[PDB]
Amino acid sequence: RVDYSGRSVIVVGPQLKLHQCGLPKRMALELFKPFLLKKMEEKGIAPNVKAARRMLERQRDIKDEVWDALEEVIHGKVVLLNRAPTLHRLGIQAFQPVLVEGQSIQLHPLVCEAFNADFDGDQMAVHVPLSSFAQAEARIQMLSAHNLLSPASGEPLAKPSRDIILGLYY
Amino acid sequence: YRAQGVKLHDKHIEIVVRQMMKYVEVTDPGDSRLLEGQVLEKWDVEALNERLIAEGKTPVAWKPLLMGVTKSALSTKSWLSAASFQNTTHVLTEAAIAGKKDELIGLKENVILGRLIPAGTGSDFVRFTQVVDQKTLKAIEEAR
Amino acid sequence: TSVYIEDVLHEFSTIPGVKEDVVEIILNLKELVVRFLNPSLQTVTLLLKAEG
Amino acid sequence: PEWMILEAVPVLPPDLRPMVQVDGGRFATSDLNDLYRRLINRNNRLKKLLAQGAPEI
Amino acid sequence: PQEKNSLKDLVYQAFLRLGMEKTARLLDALKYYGFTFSTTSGITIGIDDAVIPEEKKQYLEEADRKLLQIEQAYEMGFLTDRERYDQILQLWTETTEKVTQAVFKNFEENYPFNPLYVMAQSGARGNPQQIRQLCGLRGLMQKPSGETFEVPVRSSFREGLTVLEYFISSHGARKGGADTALRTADSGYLTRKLVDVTHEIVVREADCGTTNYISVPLFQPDEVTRSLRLRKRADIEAGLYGRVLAREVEVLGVRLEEGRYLSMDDVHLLIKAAEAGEIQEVPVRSPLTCQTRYGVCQKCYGYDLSMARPVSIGEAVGIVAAQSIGEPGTQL
Amino acid sequence: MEIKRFGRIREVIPLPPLTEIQVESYRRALQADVPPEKRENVGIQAAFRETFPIEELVLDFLEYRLGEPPFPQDECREKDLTYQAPLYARLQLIHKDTGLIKEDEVFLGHIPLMTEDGSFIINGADRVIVSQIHRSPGVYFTPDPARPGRYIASIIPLPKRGPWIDLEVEPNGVVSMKVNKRKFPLVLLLRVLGYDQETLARELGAYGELVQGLMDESVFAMRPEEALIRLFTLLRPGDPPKRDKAVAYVYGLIADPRRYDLGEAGRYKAEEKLGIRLSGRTLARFEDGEFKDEVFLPTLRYLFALTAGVPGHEVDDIDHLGNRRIRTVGELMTDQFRVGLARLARGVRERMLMGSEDSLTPAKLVNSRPLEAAIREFFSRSQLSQFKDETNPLSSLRHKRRISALGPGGLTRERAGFDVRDVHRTHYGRICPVETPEGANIGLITSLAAYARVDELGFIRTPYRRVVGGVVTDEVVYMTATEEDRYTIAQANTPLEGNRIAAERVVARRKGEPVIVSPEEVEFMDVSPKQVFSVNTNLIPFLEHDDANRALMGSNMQTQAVPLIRAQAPVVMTGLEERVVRDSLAALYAEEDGEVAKVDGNRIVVRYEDGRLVEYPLRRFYRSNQGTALDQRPRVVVGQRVRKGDLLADGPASENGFLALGQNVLVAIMPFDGYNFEDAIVISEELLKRDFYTSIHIERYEIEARDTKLGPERITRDIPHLSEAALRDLDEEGVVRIGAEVKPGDILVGRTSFVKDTSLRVPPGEGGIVVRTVRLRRGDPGVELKPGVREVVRVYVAQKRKLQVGDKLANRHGNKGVVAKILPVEDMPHLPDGTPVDVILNPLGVPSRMNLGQILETHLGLAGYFLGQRYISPIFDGAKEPEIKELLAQAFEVYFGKRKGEGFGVDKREVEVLRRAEKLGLVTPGKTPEEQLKELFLQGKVVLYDGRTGEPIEGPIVVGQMFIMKLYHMVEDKMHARSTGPYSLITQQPLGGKAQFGGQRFGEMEVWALEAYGAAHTLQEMLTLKSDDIEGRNAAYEAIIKGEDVPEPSVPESFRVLVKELQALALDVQTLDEKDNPVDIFEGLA
Amino acid sequence: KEVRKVRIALASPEKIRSWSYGEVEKPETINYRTLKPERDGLFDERIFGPIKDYECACGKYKRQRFEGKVCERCGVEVTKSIVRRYRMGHIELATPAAHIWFVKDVPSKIG
Amino acid sequence: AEPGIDKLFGMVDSKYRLTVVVAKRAQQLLRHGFKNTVLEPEERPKMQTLEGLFDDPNAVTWAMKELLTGRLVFGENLVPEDRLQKEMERLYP
Ligand SMILES: [Mg+2]
Ligand SMILES: [Zn+2]
Ligand SMILES: [Zn+2]
C-alpha cells in the first residue's frame, strides 16, 4: 500500500483537457501536502515546514493563498489515476491535477474506456510520482494523452466515447 | 480472442509462446555439463554447443521441448521469480546447491529487488544517458 | 441561517411535547420568508415562545 | 557438499524482526525472535551439556 | 456521419499523421463540442421513442404459423426431438435477427434521429440485440440447462414482459451474470502466469541482426471454404501492423524497404495486393525469431502501438503482452 | 398526495407477515408460550427428544422452559449483549437398578431470542440469520452420469447427521450400497435386517431380473448375525468383528437416531415418494436383539421401479424446491442446538463413569457449555448469521427473507456450479429469480419470494387458487414445489370476471413449463404476479419493462437505499410499499381504535376504547448496522381519532405509512455537456436547497481501556499536551458533549497510558454532529466486556450528509448513477412555465441496460407532478401505455391550462422545438402548437429550455418525477487521500493514522501496469520510497519538502534486506557484476 | 557499482561466519525495565549494530565525526542505525546441524 | 497533451530515452535552480498567479521545452559523471 496516494468516487469532467483531470481540493491538498509546504515556503504564506503543516493542520486553516500555492505546485505535475481492477497497461494513466469543488475524483470521459471505468459508484486510486524522473515518465509515457492508442491492439483506446459519439453523430 | 470480438496484436501472443518455446530437453549429455532429461533454455544450450563445438567437444543433442506457461515459468533460471511462486525452499535449495549466476534480467526478478526494472527507463540502453549545454560542454572541452 | 432551541443540543435532537423533531422543524424554518423593510439591515434574530 | 550441514546458524538482523511496542504497551514480537530464542535454549543447553559431559541419551 | 468506428479511425489517422498532441487536443475538442452538442441535441429515451415496428407484429404472426407447422412436422416425425428443438432454435434465431433488422430499418426509414437508433447506430451506447429487446420482441431465453426455452419472450420491453416470460428471462440473465462475475476474480489469473513467463522479456537490442523471420500468411484456408481464401480483415492487421520486414517487399509497384516498419496503410496496400494476389505471406521479424536470450530486439517486435512509432528500445514488451492478453480475459 | 390505484387483478389474499419465515420458524423451534404438555416434537423440543433419554443410570427428559429475556432489545443493542432467554430444562434421572427417581430443572445457559421483526441481537450487533438452501433429507434417485440406462439411488440425511447412502446398480445387476466412500453388496445389509431371501424376492420380485441380481447364497446361508459381522469386516477392516461392537457400528450408522438423523421433512419425503411410513427418523431400528428395516426395502423397490420404468415412478431433481429444503432460522438454531445436546450426551457419558454411581441427579450430570458454545458459535461466527442490513427497513426486511446456499451444513463456494446457481423451474412463486447479489457469490443467495413462506418441513410454499371448472375459487391452497408439478396453475394476468375466468384460451404453467390451456384444463391460479419475486423486486414499478439483470441490481440497491430527512414515497409505486413498513416494523402503529392523548417526537401515547393508556417510545436516530439513522416521525395530530392497524408515527425511509427509500425528483433525461456520462447524474442545486437527498449517518466510535504495569488507561477530559480550545467540545468525563460538532482531528474520547497520550481522536474520514454517547464502565448493570478491558466508551456521531458531487444515486430500475456536477438552479434545463429540472439523467444509461421502467416511471412522474397524485402500479399488473397517455392528457391540460387561461400564446422557442421535433417526427405535422405540445406531452416529453443558453433544447426531452434514491455508497466514506501515513509496525508499509489516512493498495496488477509503462523510476519509487522503504521515504518527504525533485534510491532497501534474509538461512547470495566483482550492495557495512 | 547478476550458492561455515559480527550466545531479548537489548542477545549492538544513528550504546561517541570506530566501553560501532536491518549474527553449534531445507525438501538433496 | 511531445519522441530513438533525458535535465534544473537553463528569458515557461505571471516551478516542463529547442545534447557516455557533475556545479552553485 502506497504513501503518496488517494482515492474517491469518480465523476466525469468534461471541462478538463485529456492531459488533466479533476481532483477534490481535499484530495489535491493531501496528495501534494509536502509539495504545498514547499511552495508555501517559496511564497509568502508559511515560514518553514512545521509552520506550513500547522498551516494545513485543521479544516478552517485553508485559505486563498494556500489553494493558490497548491495550484502553483500541481501546475506541470501529474497524478497517476488507476481503476480497480487493473487489467492492462492503460489501467493507470497520468493526468495534470485540476482542483475541483466536491469530494469526488473528476475523471476525463475519454479514458473511461481505457480504464474500463463507469460512473456508477466506481472508485479510483490516485498516486503522485514524487521524483522528477518518475514525474517525467509519468507525463511522458503514462500521460493519458500520450497513450491514445491501445498498446494491445494499436487501436485508439482514447477514442470519443459514448456521449461524444452521440452528439457528433447527431 | 477473435471469437469474442477482441482483436489484440499477434505480437504479444508470439512473445508468450516464445517464452514457452525457450526450454529444451537433452537427448545426449555429450561433453557438456548437462545430462539426459535436464531442462534448460534454447539459447543457453545453443551457446554451450557453439562453445563446445568450437572447442573440439561433442555438442548437445537437444530435443525441442514445449512446456506450459506456468511450467515454463516454474523451470526458469530466475530462481527469484521461481522462489516467488511456490515452495521457495525447494527453489532456493536447488539453486544454491549450484552457484547460480542469476542475471537481474527480468522485471519480476528485479521488483523483489527494488532497482530500476530492466524496462523503459531502467533499460541499460536508455538509463545511461546524459544531458548538457554548450555553456557546459565548452568548459568541458577546455580542460580536456 | 441559524437556529437555537432551548433544551436542544443539536439538530438531530427532538423536543418534548413537540411533534416535529428539530430536523423537521428546521426544515419548516427554511420555508420562512422574511422581508427586511430596511435595506441597510442585514440580520434579524426572531424569538419564539409557545406552549400548550 | 559438506556445506549443507551448518555448524554455525546465521542470525537475521534485529529490525527485520521488530520486537516493538504496539497499542497499549503490547509488545508484538516476530516469531523469529522466539525461534532463535528456543534455538539458543537448546544450543547453550548442548554446550553446557558437553562441558558437563552428560550421558549419551 | 460520425460514429464510433469513424471517430476511432479519425483519432488513429490523426495520431499517425498530425501527431500525439494535436490528436489529444483534437480529442478534447471532439469532447467539448460533442458534449455541448449532446446537450443541444436533446437526445432522450421515451417509451414512445422506443418505437416498436409493425413488422414485429407481422413477424410474430409469421413465426407463430411457422412454428405451428413445425410442431406438425414433429407429429409427422421426420425430425428427431433434438431436431424439433433445433427447428425451434433455428426459427427464433433468424426471427430475432429479422425483428432486429426490422427495428433498425423502421428506424432509419421513419425515425433517423431516434435516440435509441442514433445511440445504437453511432455505437455510442447499445447494440442491435439490446435495441431489439427494447423495441421489437426480446430474444429467446435459455432453460436452466444448456437448452433454450421453446417459448421466447415475444413481449417487448415497451409493452411489458409477462411474469413467466420474466422468469425464463431471469434464467439466462442470472446465467450471464454468473459468467461475467466469475471472471472478475480471474481477471488477473492469466495475466499473473503470463507475467510469470513474460517478466524477463523487453526490448534490449535495437537489432539482434537475426536473418530469421516469421511469415504471417495473409491467406488462411477457412475450414468451411476449403480454399486459399483471404483471411479476416482484422486478423491481417493484428498480425502485420507495425512490423519489420527481413525481406524487402515490392507490391502495387511500391517498394517496402528491407528492415522497414510497416504501417496500417502499408498493411492495407498489402491486403489490396493480396486481393490482386501479389503475395500470400509476409516476411516479417518476430519475437519468435529474435536471438536475444531474455528479450526481443527492436526490429523483431515492431511498432510500439501506444505511440505508433518503432518500439522504444527498453519497453516492457513482455508485461505489455501479459496485460494485453490478460485484460480481455474478463470479456471472454 | 392522492393515490391512483392501477391494475385490474385483485390480490385475493394480503401478503404473509414478510418476517414470518424467520419469526414463525424460530417460535416453532422455541415454543416458549406453548406449555410443556402441548409442545410439538419440533425445534428445541425435537432436539431434547432425540438426545434424551441417555441410556448410559438413565438420564431422561421431562420438559423445558424458556425464561424472559434478562434485558429488552434496546438494552441488548446498547451494551454489546445477546438478546437471549435463559434456557431451562426439567429432567429426571432414574437409577436402573435402584429404581429411585430424582428430578431437577437445569439452567442450560441462554438462547438468543428473535425480535418481533424477525432479527436477532448478538453481542449487541443486530444480526439476521439468512435461511439456508440445502439438499433436503429423505431419499433421492438421480440418473447415473456414467451409466445411462441405470439410476443411482441416494439416501441423504440431515447435514452432519449421517453419511450419504447410495444404492447403485452395476452392469451385472447386483445391488450395491455406498457409504463412507465404501461400496458393498446391499444384500449383506439386507440380511443384517433380519430379512429372509423370501422377503426380498417377494417384495421386489415383480420388478425384474435385477432382483435375481440381489440374490446371494453366501449372504443368505448365514443368519443376520454373521451377515452383520461380515458387513463390519467389510466397512472396518482390521477391527475385530466381535458381535456386540459390530452391532454397535451398524446401529450407530443407521439404527441410532442420535448419530444418524434423517430429517422429519426428509421423513415426509421418504413417506410420500416411497408410499411407506417411518416409525422414527431412522433407516432402521433395533428391536429384541435383531434389526428391523424401515427405509432400504422401499428405496430399493422404487429404484428397481425407475430402472424397469414402472409408471407412477419419477426421478428426483436435486435442485427441485420440493426436493431442496430451506433450513430456516429455527431449524438451523435447533440443529446446532441438537449437536450441542449430542455433546451434552457424550459429556454425560463421560460424567457417569466418575464418582458416586448411586449419588446422581439431573443436575450433577448435565454439562451445558457444549450447548452454549454451539449456539453462540452459530450466532456469532457463522456465515448464515450476518449483520442486519439496517440501511433501510426494506433492507432488513429482505435480509430476513434472504436465502443462502452457503453456510455450515450446506454448500461451499466450489461445491456450487451453475447447476445450483441457475434458477430452477420451481423457484416461481417460491424464490426471487432476480434478488441474487451481483458480482461474485451470485446465484447462491437467492432471496425468498414475496407471497412465499416456509412450512414446518422447510419447503417453500406458494399460495395458489384452486379452481372449479371455468370458475376460479377464493380458496387459497399453499403448495410445495413437489405438489405444484402435479397440477396446472394459470397465471394471474388472465382476465377474471369476479371469480370466473372469461378467457377462451388461458396462459398457464404446468410442472415448470408454460402451456396454453382451457378454463376446464385450469386447476389452480397465481394469487398475484407479486408472488414470484422478493419484496425488493416487488417494490419496483414497471418491472415488466425492466431487464432481469438491471432489476437484479435495482432490487439489490434497494438494500443500500438510504433514508432521508424528507424521504418521499415513490411517485410510482406497486402497492406493496404500504405493507413493507408495517411488516418491517419500522413505523409504529395502533393496537386499537382510540384517541392520541399525547403526541411527541420521543413518544406517542394513545388512549384506547379499553381506556388503557399505551405509550410508544419512538426510536429516534438509532445507528443502523450500515450507518444510516433510524428515525420515527409522527403523522397524527394531537388529540385525534385513530383506528386499529393505523399509523401513529412514520418509520425510517417512510412517508405517510409507505416505504420511502429516497425522494422522487423531477428528472429530465438528456445528455448535459457530458456531465451525465456513463451513468453519471447531473443534479439541480434546488434539490440541495430544499434538503432533498440529505442522509443522516451515524458512525460508531469506541475506546477500550486495558491495565498495564506502567499504567492503565482511562476515559478522561484530562488529555496531555492539548489546549482547552481543542477540548472545547469535551465534557468532564472525556466524552464529547452531546450536540457538539467534531471534525477529523478533534477528540472524541480520552485515554492515556505509559504519562503519554494514546486517546483516539476523530478519524480523518468521518466527522460531524454527536447525537448520543454510551458510557460502559466495568461491571455496569448488565454489561459484558472483553477480557482485559477496563472500560468501553462508545460515541455515536451522526451527521446530515447532503447530496454532494459523486454520491451514488439510483432508481429502482437499476440505474446506478453518480452525482456529476450539482449545477445551480440557473444553468439547468427548465419548463416553459419556469420550473427547473431536479435531476438530469444520461439517456445512454437506458438502451444498453434495457430497463424502460425508469422511462415509464418518468412518464408517470410527469402526470403525478401536474396532477399532484402518486400512483400505485402493481408489478406486471401495472398501467400500460394508453392509461399513462390519458393521465398525461389530463396532466397536460393542467400544465398548459394555466398558460391558456392567463392569455398566453405559444412560445416562439416552443414552436421552434416543435419544428425540430416535426423534423424528428415525434409530433404530428400540420397541427396547432397547442395540439403539437399535447401529443408531445403524451410522449412523456416536454419542450425544455437550456437554462444556460436560453435557446430551447432542439428536440424535446422526457421529464418527470423519478424515485431516485441515495445509496450507502456515498463519497465522504470513500474519499481517502494522503501525503504520507503512519507505517504499520509488523510491516513498514503505511497503514492508517491518527491525523492522516491509510495507505493505498498498489496491487500486483498496478505493478504490472507501471512495468509495462517502463516507468522503472516510478515503480522503484512506488514500491520502495513510497512504501516499504523507510530510509528512502525519509529522504522522499525531506527532499520533496525542500523541493528537491530527485529522491534518491541508489540501493533498493528490499534487495539488501532480501540478501540478508537469504543469508540468515545460511544461503550465500553474493552479488556480482559482469566482471564477477562482488559489488557490495550494502555499500559497505557488511 | 552496477550489480548485473546475483549468485545464490551454499555457504561454508567460513562464509556463514563472514557476514556475522558476533556470536548470539544468549536467548535473551528486550526486558521490561530497560528497552535496551540484553547481554549478547538477538538485538545486542555488540553484534548487530547501534540502535541510533552514529551513536553507541553508552553514548561516548554521539556523532558522525566518528565512523567505523568501535567503542571501547560498550563495543558498538558508530554507524547508521539502519545497519540493524542488515548486519548479521551467528550461532555456534556444539554439534553441527543439517539445514532442514536440504534435508526435507523433496527430493532430499542430502538424501 | 504535452507541447511538442511528437517532436520530442522524434528526437529520441526511444520514448524512454526521452524520459531519462527530460528527467535528468529536470534534476539538473532543480539541483542548479533553473539558472543553468538554455531557455532564453522569453522562452521561459510562464504560469498565472493572483499576482501575475511567474516562472514555471515544474522542472519537467522546462526540460521538455529546452529539449524542443534542440540546444540540449543527449547521448550515451557524453562525459564522465564525476567531471560532468563537478563542471555543472562549478558553473552553478
Ligand atoms: Mg461500475
Ligand atoms: Zn530480434
Ligand atoms: Zn559506546
Q: Do E156 and E48 share a structural domain?
A: yes
- Output the domain CATH number for residue A90: 2.40.40.20
Say whether both A103 and A142 belong to one domain.
Answer: yes
Q: For residues E144 and E219, state if they share a domain.
A: no
For residue F27, what is the enclosing H or E element?
Answer: helix F20-30
F81 φ/ψ angles, rounded to the nearest 5 degrees = -110, 160
d(Cα G26, Cα G40) in Å, to the nearest integer? 6
Q: Give the Cα separation of F424 and F555 in Å (integer).
A: 20
Q: Looking at the DSSP assignment, which residues form a beta bridge with residue F1068?
A: G9
Residues A104, A40 share a domain:
no
Beta strands in F843-898 (DSSP E): 869-872
Nearest to E175, CA basis, from F433, G28, F34:
F433
For CA atoms E183, E184, E185, E190, give the dihedral sign.
Answer: positive
- Cα separation of E191 and F78, whole Å? 49
DSSP strand pairing (D26-28 vs F284-287)? unpaired
Q: Tell me the C-alpha distance between F77 and F90, whole Å.
A: 31
| Calpha distance F1043→F575 (Å, rounded) | 64
- Across F323-354, b (16+ Cβ under 10 Å) vs e yields bbbbbbbbbbbbbbbbbbbbbbbebbeebbee
Which one of F1057, F1063, F1070 has the shortest CB-CB distance to G88? F1063
Instruction: Specify the 3-state DSSP secondary structure of D14.
Output: coil
What is the spatial distance between Cα B73 and Cα F960, in angstroms, rounded to a whole number?
59
- The closest of C30, C8, C3 to C18, measured between CA atoms, is C8
Residues of A in contact with H30 (CB under 8 A): 132
SS (H, E, C) F382-427: CCCEEECCCCCHHHHHHHHHEEECCCCCCCCCCCCCHHHHCCCHHH
What is the CA(F260)–ligand 1 centre distance, in A?
Answer: 48
A84 and A5 share one domain: yes
| Dihedral angle over CA of B78, B83, B84, B85, nearest 10 | 100
Nearest-CA distance from B131 to chain H in Å? 5
Pairing verdict, β E249-251 and E254-256: antiparallel
**B128-144 — its CATH code?**
6.10.250.1410
Residue where the block lists cell 451445558:
F368
- Asked if G21 and G48 count as a contact pair (C-beta separation under 8 A), the reply is yes
Give the separation between CA F417 and CA F426, rounded to whole angstroms.
18
Neighbours of F507 (CB within 10 A): 18
Residue with cell 407484429: E57
Within 8 A by CB and 6+ apart from D56, the residues are none
One domain, residues A138 and A84: yes
> Which three cell numbers, joined as nine digits, stand for F145?
452420469
Cell numbers placing F500: 370466473
Yes or no: say if F332 and F132 are a contact pair by the CB < 8 Å rule: yes
Q: Which residue's entry shows cell 492508517?
A: F992
**Cβ proximity of F51 and F341 under 8 Å:** yes
Q: How far is A134 from chain E (nearest CA, A)?
A: 16
Which residues of E are annotated as part of the binding site for Zn(2+)? 208, 290, 297, 300
Among B116, B121, B123, B130, the strongest candidate for a mutation testing the H interface, having the largest count of H CBs within 10 A, is: B130
Distance CA F825, CA G72 (A): 80
Strand F182-185, strand F175-179: pairing: antiparallel
Q: Which domains does chain H have, with CATH numbers?
A: 1-93 (3.90.940.10)
Nearest-Cα distance to chain B for F1054, in Å, is: 5
Classify each residue of E276-296 as buried b or exposed e, where b means 16 or more C-beta atoms within 10 Å of its C-beta: eebbeebbbbbbbbbebbbbb
Residue A43 shares a structural domain with residue A69: yes
List chains touching G (3+ CB pairs under 8 A): B, D, F
Task: Detail the residues of A annotated as belonging to a binding site for Mg(2+).
Answer: 118, 120, 122
CA F604/CA F1079 separation, integer angstroms: 82
Q: Chain B: list its partners (3+ Cβ pairs within 8 Å).
A: A, E, F, G, H
Whether F295 and F139 have beta carbons less than 8 Å apart is answered as yes
- Same topology for domains B23-66 and B128-144, yes or no? no
Does A113 share its domain with A81? yes
Same domain, A46 and A122: no
Which residue shows C-alpha cell 474520514? F765
> Do strands F839-841 and F665-669 pair parallel, antiparallel, or not at all (unpaired)?
parallel
Which residue from F768, F747, F777, F767 is spatially nearest to F759, judged by alpha carbons? F747
Q: Is the Cβ pair F1053, B114 closer than 8 Å?
A: yes
Ligand at shortest distance from the CA of B15: 2
Q: Supply B89's cell numbers.
A: 525452499
Beta pairing, strands F138-143 & F131-135: unpaired
Pair (A54, A105) in one structural domain: no
Q: Is the CB of residue E55 less than 8 Å from the CB of residue E97?
A: no
What is the rounded CA–CA span in Å between residue F566 and residue F562? 11
Pairing verdict, β F84-94 and F58-61? antiparallel
- Asked whether residue A6 falls in the same domain as residue A66, the answer is no
Strands G20-23 and G88-90, bridge-based pairing = parallel
Which of A7, E272, E145, B70 lies closest to F971, judged by CA?
A: A7
Instruction: With beta carbons under 8 A apart, name residues in chain E contacting F554.
Output: none
Q: Which ligand is nearest to the CA of A121?
A: 1
Closest CA to G4 of F989, A103, B103: B103
Extract the runs of DSSP E, i.e. beta strands, from chain A: 5-12, 20-24, 79-83, 92-100, 105-107, 123-127
- Phi (first) and psi of residue F888, to 5 degrees: -70, -20
CA distance F510 to F531: 16
Question: Grid coordinates standing for A99?
Answer: 482542483
- The secondary structure of residue F1074, as a DSSP letter, is T
Burial class (CB in 10 A: 0-12, 13-18, 19+), F717: middle
CATH number of the domain encompassing residue E64:
1.10.132.30
Give the three cell numbers for residue F657. 405509512
**Could B97 and G105 be called an inter-chain contact, meaning their C-beta atoms sit closer than 8 Å?**
no
- Rounded CA-CA distance G76/E220 in Å is 75
For residue F817, report the distance from its CA to the centre of ligand 1, in Å.
9
Fold of B23-66: Wheat Germ Agglutinin (Isolectin 2); domain 1 (3.30.60)
d(CA F351, CA F362): 12
Domain that holds residue A66: 24-76
Residue ranges making up the domain that contains E88: 44-160
Q: For helices E189-198 and B10-20, what crossing angle results, to 10°?
A: 60
Q: Which ranges constitute the DSSP H helices of F532-659? A: 535-539, 548-557, 577-583
Q: What angle do CA F504, F510, F511 make, to 5 degrees?
A: 175
Q: Tell me E230's DSSP state.
A: B
Phi, psi (5° rounding) for residue A168? -60, -45
* Identity of the residue in F806, F1008, F1037 whose CB atom sits nearest the CB atom of A104: F806
- Counted residue by residue, chain D has a size of 57
The single-letter code of the amino acid at E326 is G
Q: Where does F215-351 have alpha helices with state H?
A: 217-221, 224-235, 243-250, 264-274, 296-308, 329-351
Residues of A forming the annotated binding site? 118, 120, 122
| Start-to-end Cα distance in chain E | 31
**CA F560 to CA F569: how far, in whole Å?**
16
Experimental method: X-ray
Q: How far is the CA of G87 from the centre of ligand 3 (A)?
A: 18
